[PDB]
Design a protein around this ligand. Sequence first.
Ligand SMILES: O=C(O)Cn1ccc(Br)cc1=O
Length: 165
Amino acid sequence: SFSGYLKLTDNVYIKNADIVEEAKKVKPTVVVNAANVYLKHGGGVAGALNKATNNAMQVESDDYIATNGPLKVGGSCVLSGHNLAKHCLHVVGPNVNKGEDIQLLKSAYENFNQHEVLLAPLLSAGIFGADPIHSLRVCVDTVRTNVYLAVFDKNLYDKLVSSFL
Ligand SMILES: O=C(O)Cn1ccc(Br)cc1=O
């Protein structure tokens, strides 16, 4: 199971970890991907998860987009977790760098409530441009299911823990 996590609330846990390495170790039922609406897994968490699947996540995602069209910002889809998890929940948080609406971050986190337990990154953090402290606050105030947050950057992990209200 999940180990070495710091408990933030009744249902939110956090660890300084590479989510790919965490997924390979725990083999969770659900790993959350920081997806974009096109499921183009180029960089950040998406690029790293996709590379760990030997591009199988991207091939599967391109078939999903060909059939269904793009996701909405704030939306999600459930696809295979390949060698990382039973399922991958591709969640689209708003990308501030692309001028997307930051109020959609709460809608993005609501997707986590459809899964009892998840391994996840902070939505809209990193290359998505949002304030990670604000993302963690929205996470704790929105997600009611068991979420295990993997924060890649040590300095950010330390700041998130020390500033947590
Ligand atoms: O650490 C993360 O999980 C995401 N991330 C990565 C690197 C930096 Br710097 C900021 C940030 O939000």
